Design a binder for this molecule. Structure first.
Ligand SMILES: [Mg+2]
Ligand SMILES: [Mg+2]
Ligand SMILES: [Mg+2]
Ligand SMILES: [Mg+2]
Ligand SMILES: [Mg+2]
Ligand SMILES: [Mg+2]
Ligand SMILES: [Mg+2]
Ligand SMILES: [Mg+2]
Ligand SMILES: [Mg+2]
Ligand SMILES: [Mg+2]
Ligand SMILES: [Mg+2]
Ligand SMILES: [Mg+2]
Ligand SMILES: [Mg+2]
Ligand SMILES: [Mg+2]
Ligand SMILES: [Mg+2]
Ligand SMILES: [Mg+2]
Ligand SMILES: [Mg+2]
Ligand SMILES: [Mg+2]
Ligand SMILES: [Mg+2]
Ligand SMILES: [Mg+2]
Lengths: 203, 97, 205, 175
RNA sequence: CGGCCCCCGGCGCGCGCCCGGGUCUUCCCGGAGUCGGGUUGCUUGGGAAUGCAGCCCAAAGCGGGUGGUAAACUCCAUCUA
RNA sequence: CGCGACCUCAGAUCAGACGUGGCGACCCGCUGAAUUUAAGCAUAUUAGUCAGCGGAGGAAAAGAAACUAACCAGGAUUCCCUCAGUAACGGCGAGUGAACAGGGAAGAGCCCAGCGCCGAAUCCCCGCCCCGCGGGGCGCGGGACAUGUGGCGUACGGAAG
């Protein structure tokens, strides 16, 4: 009854009723730490449509990342190579900051499983996300077999292999003529199948 | 007389026009969500670019308002629909005596 | 480096191809593996036929292969509804179901419907309890076989429309000349511009 | 205010939803009575309120709600902000109350956030009408007045005392 | 080919669950700093920018994306992020 | 002044449970040159590789279209032969370079947030009893989670009453 109203109020996030609450929450979260346990989701509709259910074993981490592109870590801005690569100031890091937040949350807590994550704040520098974490060894998650897929050990650390929503969106895989660079599996699998010099017994 | 190219191009087969699939029912009228949106617009208010585009469409120039909406949102057809929406909101609210 | 009159060669060997050389030394190995896979399926799984579900008559999308025909994927839900059975009931009967395949032609519609009627006629099913719904006795000594090969119906059916014996006729032989194709090509190239000039002739009074 | 809130809680205390103990008690009792005595309709209509924002929004959209009680202390305010305007546009009276814990303790839960009076008893319609008249006097009839007024914008008391001291100095200069 | 010991599968006595198909009427019908636009880097065969990412601007609901040459008008096909 | 409820929280050698590290031929995510070629060298090629870092399984990834096509249309993902050294990219130099068709192995499809209806009919834990071999569950009595939303019915191939 309510979540469509919550969604439509969150959509136009530039209006005066929302931007006050957004500025107050950005101040409140900027004065907090970097990675800490929010006891309940601040966006219930978005958390529930990403996969949160109000039961024992689902944990929200509020996490803060720093905006901007990456600087190449070479000393004194020297690359020692051809003029293709002197751009120390500008590389823009093909994974999104949401994926960085998922990596940091799951790597701080490898005992949990990163399901998804969602934006909750920005000012100019600190981008704020909330990451939902499944506890694979709680009994309410090891039962209820619509959830038992994440208990299986092939889903350990989805956030660093690129299996979450922001992970897949950073990999850039989809059906179409816009994705011939990664035709199947991954771009390295496509490179493997397209530069494997295939030979046979009979030629 | 049938042939390959021209106006009646291809082999002549009979049509099978039926009711379309449910996937066409995606962004339709939907009076319930219309009630939701039409409530929540006057619950919240308007964006700042909308609030100055209503002024530019009221007094200054419709072409300048369309150019400002074309600059602030993506494309020309988006600018057309946003201009028509703001003009409908303007004529429906601020013209009722 | 080049030489006498020979073809300009650009081989793609500048990349380190020596690491990724996949030579099929296990090609009879994969052949024996896949033989044993199919035979183990036909033994252990069911007395269902090999290549289990029935495939549709399907025309290939091109200007090149559309004269030919193909075993498709599934039976295109409107076709299955005209045949008159439920979706997963059809999937357990053995009907391959694709919910994406549309229907444009009543010809191909009725072709797949008659193919469904033929498959339902050829169907002999065995329920669990011996109360016999929708079967009879041991028909044809339990059908004398329990495994079919290379499709149930051999779904190609290359049609042979012959239309051989006819006499050369009246002025159609003096009417169907070469100029029809060039007239149709010029009409297709100059369709809309003539409509624009007709609109301008109606506009300029 | 607390007088009308006390009247509201005195009305809402006897429409309390059942807990697990008396729920299981009523289930076992009614099951044994319909097993032994074989009663067809032992209960005509159970009067009980509704809780939860998903339930209350549905009830005000379908006009089943007679009265809406809206809690104050919800930490995401976005969960609640649409409900006063929605009850105003659907004509259902709503009262904003302070303290969601006091509303949870009439539903046997920590937070309740919303309470919808939909069905009333025979000897309670007059008291409900007496409450709804004051609630429509306070909230519903003044909605065009509340929507224009801005809140907050109060400086710190040290700065207010500084501005007042400068204002008294300016008045001493002008007089 | 033969005998013994050990392990796994599918028949047949109890405990727990058990309503689908067609006609007619009414009602519902969707994932947001997300798509998209500008700009900047890397990558691609992808060229008036294939994909990913930084910053800014940032939606619609007969909507949105795709239709391989940018842009406007119009028609049609397909899909529903 | 005190008591109580909710919410943000902290502590413990609290009861129970979980991640660290190794191997790394195969796979996934990031990052990343230069020797070499261009008979010279900056774009380019070497290469989206070597090296580095992070993850898991016997496979991994992908996977049920915001697809291909443009005609008598097909229809999840992967793999092989073709397409093809072609379309295209490139000091249009050196060189780089796919895809849809089509034929084959495999064939399996599905679920959730929303929409409402069901008196939260849902789930975790504690204690005694019905009991089994080599070990753990259907019921009984109370402490929690959950109305800021459990579970059933439902998924765009329409669904519900
Ligand atoms: Mg909790
Ligand atoms: Mg996957
Ligand atoms: Mg040879
Ligand atoms: Mg549409
Ligand atoms: Mg020589
Ligand atoms: Mg080399
Ligand atoms: Mg559009
Ligand atoms: Mg369009
Ligand atoms: Mg076009
Ligand atoms: Mg074009
Ligand atoms: Mg490890
Ligand atoms: Mg040299
Ligand atoms: Mg040199
Ligand atoms: Mg390169
Ligand atoms: Mg390496
Ligand atoms: Mg292992
Ligand atoms: Mg789908
Ligand atoms: Mg060739
Ligand atoms: Mg060349
Ligand atoms: Mg290359």
């Amino acid at each position: 009854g309510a979540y469509k109203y919550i969604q439509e109020l969150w959509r136009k996030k530039q209006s005066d009723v929302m931007r006050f609450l957004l500025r107050v929450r950005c101040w409140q979260y900027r004065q907090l730490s970097a990675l800490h346990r929010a006891p309940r989701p601040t966006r219930p509709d978005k958390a529930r449509r990403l996969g949160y259910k109000a039961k024992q074993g689902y944990v929200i981490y509020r996490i803060r990342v720093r905006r901007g592109g990456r600087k190449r870590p070479v000393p004194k801005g020297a690359t020692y190579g051809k003029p293709v690569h002197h751009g120390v100031n500008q590389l823009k890091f093909a994974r999104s900051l949401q994926s960085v937040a998922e990596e940091r949350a799951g790597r701080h807590c490898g005992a949990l499983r990163v399901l998804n994550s969602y934006w909750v704040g920005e000012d100019s520098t600190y981008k704020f996300f909330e990451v939902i974490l499944i506890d694979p060894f709680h009994k309410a998650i090891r039962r209820n077999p619509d959830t038992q897929w994440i208990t299986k050990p092939v889903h350990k650390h989805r956030e660093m292999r690129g299996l979450t929503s922001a992970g897949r969106k950073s990999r850039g895989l989809g059906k179409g003529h816009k994705f011939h660079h990664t035709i199947g599996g991954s771009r390295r699998a496509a490179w493997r199948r397209r530069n494997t010099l295939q030979l046979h017994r009979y030629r | 007389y049938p042939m390959a190219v021209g106006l009646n191009k291809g082999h002549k087969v009979t049509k099978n026009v039926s009711k379309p699939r449910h996937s066409r029912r995606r962004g339709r009228l939907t009076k319930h969500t219309k009630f939701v949106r039409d409530m929540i617009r006057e619950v919240c208010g308007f964006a700042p670019y909308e609030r100055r585009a209503m002024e530019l469409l009221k007094v200054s120039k419709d072409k300048r308002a369309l150019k400002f909406i074309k600059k602030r949102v993506g494309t020309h057809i988006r600018a057309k629909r946003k201009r028509e929406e703001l003009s409908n909101v303007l004529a429906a609210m601020r013209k009722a005596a | 480096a080049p030489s006498r009159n020979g073809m300009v060669l650009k081989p793609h060997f500048h990349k380190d191809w020596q690491r990724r050389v996949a030579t099929w030394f296990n090609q009879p190995a994969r052949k024996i593996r896949r033989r044993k896979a199919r035979q183990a399926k036909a033994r252990r799984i069911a007395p269902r036929p090999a290549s289990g579900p029935i495939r549709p008559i399907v025309r290939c999308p091109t200007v090149r292969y559309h004269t030919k025909v193909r075993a498709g994927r599934g039976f295109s839900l409107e076709e299955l509804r005209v045949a008159g059975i439920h979706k997963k009931v059809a999937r357990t009967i053995g009907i391959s179901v694709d919910p994406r395949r549309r229907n444009k032609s009543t010809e191909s519609l009725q072709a797949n419907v008659q193919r469904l009627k033929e498959y339902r006629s050829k169907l002999i099913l065995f329920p669990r309890k011996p109360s016999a719904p929708k079967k009879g006795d041991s028909s044809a000594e339990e059908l004398k076989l329990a495994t079919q090969l290379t499709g149930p119906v051999m779904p190609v059916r290359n049609v042979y429309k012959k239309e051989k014996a006819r006499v050369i006729t009246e002025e159609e032989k003096n009417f169907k000349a070469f100029a029809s194709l060039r007239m149709a090509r010029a009409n297709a190239r100059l369709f809309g511009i003539r409509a624009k000039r007709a609109k301008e002739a109606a506009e300029q009074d | 205010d607390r007088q009308t809130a006390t009247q509201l809680l005195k009305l809402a205390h006897k429409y309390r939803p059942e807990t697990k103990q008396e729920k299981k008690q009523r289930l076992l009792a009614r099951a044994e009575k319909k097993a032994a005595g074989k009663g067809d309709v032992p209960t005509k209509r159970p009067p009980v309120l509704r809780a939860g924002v998903n339930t209350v929004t549905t009830l005000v959209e379908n006009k089943k709600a007679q009265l809406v009680v809206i809690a104050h202390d919800v930490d995401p305010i976005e969960l609640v902000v649409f409900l006063p305007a929605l009850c105003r546009k659907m004509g259902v009276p709503y009262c904003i109350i302070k303290g969601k814990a006091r509303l949870g303790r009439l539903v046997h839960r920590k937070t309740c956030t919303t309470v919808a009076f939909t069905q009333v008893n025979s000897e309670d319609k007059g008291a409900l009408a007496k409450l709804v008249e004051a609630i429509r006097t306070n909230y519903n009839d003044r909605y065009d007045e509340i929507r224009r007024h801005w809140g907050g914008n109060v400086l710190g008391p040290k700065s207010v005392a500084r501005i007042a001291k400068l204002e008294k100095a300016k008045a001493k200069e002008l007089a």
